[PDB]
């Protein structure tokens, strides 16, 4: 029923509909669009930053010293051209809790993995380079589902030994 | 839970996977529609969960624990390759697979961790010994001078 | 009708045939009632109590360190403001402060 | 889920499996599929396939040894396919995937097998901690010796 | 609604509005201005002195002697030309307690 | 199924044959740990008495 809808720059409007049966999908963020009674679908994707609290319990580095490392990461859905095809075909309309939970578990695994990759002396002295390597290893996979990594680091480190 | 490695040591291993139906591929989607119509999300998740658990628990005996926590990238890549092949055969493509947590109820890894803790505690004690000797030497010497001067005055 | 704004907020709205981003903070925009959508961002500077508890130094000694920061959204830069509007619309002041505080 | 099943060497195991089965879509095999089963309900498919694959899985498990199901069980599933396709496909049921869910023993085979290396890492840890304690003790004794010598020299001057 | 407003020298009147869509911001302290129903915004900035009581507890100098030093500082919003663009785009209309708290922590 | 315990002994044979390996590994580990633990103990005591 609703016709000629527009969305602000914070959210991306996604529409898809076959005018003559051919696949015509339009994804526009903060722009203009029109949709008739049943020509396409009117949905929006919230491109706001999702908060991350990665907290790994009883995780060990190369030398094996057990640590309970808590992290913080900045994640947001990207605005590229071909990657937003994947973003639109991928997730919505699952709600924000679903984004945050999925990204939380996957970055939890990735963070524990890279934490095991380097030693505790490195996470002690040079952990800015640790975050730089976290970017280098997490961009290839976290970007597959259209989620960007604006920033990454670890919140606090606690040890029982 | 309680899965043996290639040494046979049992370790509790948790994994997390992100699986999606690649509708871009016409052939794969057509194959998937032949059985996934009429199935709820819970059952769809559960069946692939058991399949991926089978693949992970089978590959458990390929790579040892020493390999899994140290060399995790090659492990994850091989797991993804094999699971993705056998699941695209079924019709689901795994977006990304990861290992959540590794737990040992046999105290196998705790000693390996404690070794380095001892190796650093020896340094912690050596520093204290340095500081104590350096403080005591000159404290005693200054004590000596003040007493000598006090008796000279007496 | 035109909607005036002060210099502490950014008025960014989508109307009709306005595909390129619109950076308005301290101006007016003719807004259709049933066509355009209105959203706001506050540019006022917020203070942050950046607190660190039991953090190790390069000797490893743990010291409790507290920090204070004054952070603001530089609306003068069109590119930076356009980037910020992509995620800061619809977020309250508390969450905006809190996320940057953790970072 | 096979209970109290034994391999070639005879070690008893309670092996649980998972298999992926679906009715095929071939041309001549679907004649058999249509003339074969329906309209018995889904519980009937699952029960029949459960018992027949139970027998087949126990049989092949007996075929290979426990060392093979330990090390190379992907090849175990590959051979399960090779032996189960000729018969499970007769009633029109395909085998998309096959493997074993969990393995449990009452005569603690695998736990005994883990004993070989569950102490090797403990051996290395004990060696390392012993060496570290040795170094700490030696150099601390050296420090104590030097500080006592200087303290006694100062006390000698005080006595004078 | 209000038209042709003027403010005393103690407070600076800030107005901003795009007559033809172009950015025209006028900031005048103790002067004259006019604003129509919706041409601009009518706001004022209190340029009065803000009281400061900086009190640092358990702070140590170069040699490390701990002191609890309390200070006083005189702070006021300036009246320059280009800096008042920053002043107007920066803070208001947060109230005087907000000025004093922010300046208190930073100083 | 066998109610006469016919097959249980045939199963238990291999379990013993693997338990001997399980014990041999532990014996290796214990001897290797003890040898150098005792040696390090020896050096630290010798140095402590040298300081004394």
Chains C and E touch (3+ CB pairs under 8 A): yes
Tokens 């996470």 correspond to A123
Q: Cα(D7)–Cα(D73) distance, rounded to whole angstroms?
A: 14
**Residue pair E9/E29 in contact by the 8 Å Cβ criterion:** yes
User: Residue D66's closest chain F neighbor by CA?
Assistant: F14
Neighbours of chain D (3+ CB pairs under 8 A): B, F
Resolution (A): 3.6
Distance from CA of C78 to the nearest CA of A (A): 14
Cβ pairs A/C, distance under 8 A:
75
Closest chain A residue to C88, measured at CA: A48
Q: Is F31 on the interface with D (CB under 8 A)?
A: no
CB A151 to CB C91 under 8 A?
Answer: no
Whether residue D140 and residue B147 make contact (CB cut-off 8 A), yes or no, is no
DSSP state for residue A116 in the 8-state scheme: H
Distance between CA atoms of residues F13 and F20, nearest Å: 11
- Chains C and D lie in contact, requiring 3 or more CB pairs less than 8 Å apart: no
Please report the number of interchain residue pairs, chain A to chain B, with beta-carbon separation below 8 angstroms: 66
CA A81 from chain centre, in angstroms, equals 16
Q: Which residues pair with C11 in a beta bridge?
A: C24, C40
Tokens of E83: 């800096």
Q: What does the H/E/C string look like for chain D?
A: CCCCEECCCCCEEEEEEEEEEEECCCCHHHHHHHHHCCCCCHHHHHHHHHHHHHHHHHHHHHHCCHHHHHHCCHHHHHHHHHHHHHHHCCCCEEEEEEEEEEEECCCCHHHHHHHHHHCHHHHHHHHHHHHHHHHHHHHHHHHHHHHHHHHHHHHHHHHC
Query: Cα–Cα distance between F37 and F50 in angstroms, integer?
Result: 20
Min distance D99 CA to chain B CA atoms (Å): 6
Residues of A in contact with B96 (CB under 8 A): 106, 141, 144-145
Return the ∠ at Cα E88 (arms to E87 and E94), rounded to 5°.
90
Q: Are the CB atoms for D1 and D95 separated by under 8 Å? A: no
Q: Which residues of B26-37 are buried (b: 16+ CB within 10 A; e: fewer)?
A: eebeebbeebbe
* A68 shares contact with chain C (CB less than 8 Å): no
Q: How far apart are CA D102 and CA D3, in angstroms?
A: 12
Task: Say if the Cβ atoms of E102 and C8 lie within 8 Å.
Answer: no
CB contact under 8 A, C35 and A151: no
CB contact under 8 Å between C47 and E94, yes or no, is: no
Question: What residues 37-56 of chain B have any CB closer than 8 A to a CB of chain D?
Answer: 47, 50-51, 53-55
Please report residues of D whose CB lies closer than 8 A to that of B6.
Answer: 71
End-to-end CA distance of chain E: 41
Q: Which of C35, C60, C91 sits opposite A48 (nearest CB)?
A: C91
| D143 in reach of chain F (CB within 8 A) | no
Are the Cβ atoms of D117 and B114 closer than 8 angstroms? no
Neighbours of E8 (CB within 10 A): 11
Distance from CA of A123 to the nearest CA of C (A): 11
State the DSSP string of chain B: --EE-TT--EEEEEEEEEEE--TT-HHHHHHHHHHHTT--HHHHHHHHHHHHHHHHHHHTTTS-HHHHHHSHHHHHHHHHHHHHHHHHHHT-EEEEEEEEEEE-SSSHHHHHHHHHHHHHHHHHHHHHHHHHHHHHHHHHHHHHHHHHHHHHH-
Are there at least 3 beta-carbon pairs closer than 8 Å between A and F? no
According to the entry, how was the structure determined? cryo-EM
User: Among D6, D122, D130, whose Cβ lies nearest the Cβ of F7?
Assistant: D6
Six-digit token string for E67: 């002191």
For residue C89, give the nearest of A9, A31, A32 by CB distance: A9
Question: Which letter, b or e, does each residue of A102-124 get, where b requires 16 or more Cβ atoms within 10 Å of its Cβ?
Answer: bbbbbbbbbbbbbbbbbebeebe
Chain B contacts of D143, Cβ < 8 Å? 129-130, 132-133
CB contact under 8 A, B58 and D74: yes
Nearest Cα to A64, choosing from D10, D156, D121?
A: D121
What the block records as the tokens of E45 is 């900035």
A10: which DSSP letter? Answer: T
Three-point CA angle B128, B132, B138, nearest 5°: 150
Cα distance between residue A134 and residue A127, in whole Å: 10
- Chain C residues whose beta carbon lies within 8 Å of the beta carbon of residue A28: 19
Residues of C with Cβ-Cβ distance to E23 under 8 angstroms: 26-27
Rounded CA gap, D96 and D81, in Å? 9
Distant-in-sequence, close-in-space partners of D157: CB < 8 Å, separation ≥ 6: B144, B148
Angstroms from B109 CA to nearest CA on chain D: 8
């Amino acid at each position: 029923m609703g016709n000629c809808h527009t969305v602000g720059p914070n959210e991306a409007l996604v529409v898809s509909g076959g005018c003559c049966g051919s696949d015509y999908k339009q994804y526009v963020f903060g722009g203009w669009a029109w949709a008739w009674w049943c020509i396409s679908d009117t949905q929006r994707i919230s491109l706001e930053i999702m908060t991350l609290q990665p907290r790994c319990e009883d995780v060990e580095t190369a030398e094996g010293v057990a640590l309970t490392v808590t992290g913080v990461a900045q994640v947001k859905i990207m605005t590229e051209k071909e990657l937003l095809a994947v973003a639109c075909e991928q997730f919505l309309g699952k709600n924000v809790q679903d984004i945050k939970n999925v990204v939380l578990q996957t970055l939890e695994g990735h963070l524990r993995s890279i934490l095991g990759t380097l030693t505790v002396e490195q996470i002690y002295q040079d952990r800015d380079q640790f975050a730089k390597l976290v970017r280098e290893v997490a961009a290839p996979d976290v970007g597959r589902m259209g989620i960007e990594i604006l920033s990454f680091t670890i919140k606090d480190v606690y040890d029982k030994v | 839970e309680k899965v043996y490695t290639r040494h046979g040591v049992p370790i509790s291993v948790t994994g997390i996977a992100q699986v999606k139906i690649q509708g871009q591929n016409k052939e794969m989607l057509a194959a998937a529609c032949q059985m996934f119509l009429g199935k709820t999300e819970a059952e769809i998740a559960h069946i692939a969960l058991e399949t991926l658990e089978g693949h992970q628990r089978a590959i458990m005996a390929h790579m040892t624990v020493e390999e899994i926590y140290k060399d995790r990238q090659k492990f994850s890549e091989q797991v993804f390759k094999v699971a993705s092949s056998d699941l695209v055969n079924m019709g689901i493509s795994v977006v990304s697979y990861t290992l959540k947590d590794i737990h040992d109820d046999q105290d196998y890894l705790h000693s390996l961790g404690k070794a380095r803790t001892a190796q650093v505690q020896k340094d912690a004690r050596i520093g204290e010994a340095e500081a104590k000797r350096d403080a005591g030497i000159r404290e005693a010497k200054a004590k000596q001078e003040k007493v000598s001067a006090q008796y000279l005055s007496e | 009708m035109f909607f005036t704004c002060g210099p502490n907020e950014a008025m960014v709205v989508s109307g009709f045939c306005r595909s390129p981003p619109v950076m308005v903070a301290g101006g007016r925009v003719f807004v259709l009632p049933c066509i355009q959508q209105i959203q706001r961002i506050s540019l006022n500077t917020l203070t942050l109590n950046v607190k660190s508890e039991k953090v190790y130094t390069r000797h490893g000694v743990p010291i409790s360190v507290t920090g204070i920061a004054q952070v603001k959204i530089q609306g003068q830069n069109k590119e930076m403001l356009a980037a910020a509007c992509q995620m800061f619309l619809g977020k309250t002041e508390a969450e905006i402060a809190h996320i940057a505080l953790e970072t | 889920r096979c209970e109290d099943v034994e391999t070639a060497e005879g070690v008893a195991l309670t092996v649980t499996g998972v298999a992926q089965v679906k009715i095929m879509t071939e041309k001549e095999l679907l004649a058999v599929a249509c003339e074969q089963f329906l309209g018995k309900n889904v519980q009937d498919i699952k029960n029949v396939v459960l018992q027949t694959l139970e027998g087949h899985l126990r049989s092949i498990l007996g075929t290979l040894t426990v060392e093979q199901i330990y090390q190379d069980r992907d090849q175990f599933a590959k051979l399960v396919r090779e032996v189960a396709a000729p018969d499970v496909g007769r009633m029109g049921i395909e085998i998309l995937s096959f493997t074993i869910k969990d393995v449990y023993d009452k005569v603690d085979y695998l736990s005994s097998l883990g004993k070989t290396q569950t102490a090797v890492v403990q051996r290395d840890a004990d060696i390392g901690v012993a060496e570290a304690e040795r170094d700490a003790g030696i150099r601390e004794a050296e420090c104590k010796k030097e500080m006592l010598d200087v303290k006694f020299m100062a006390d000698t001057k005080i006595a004078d």
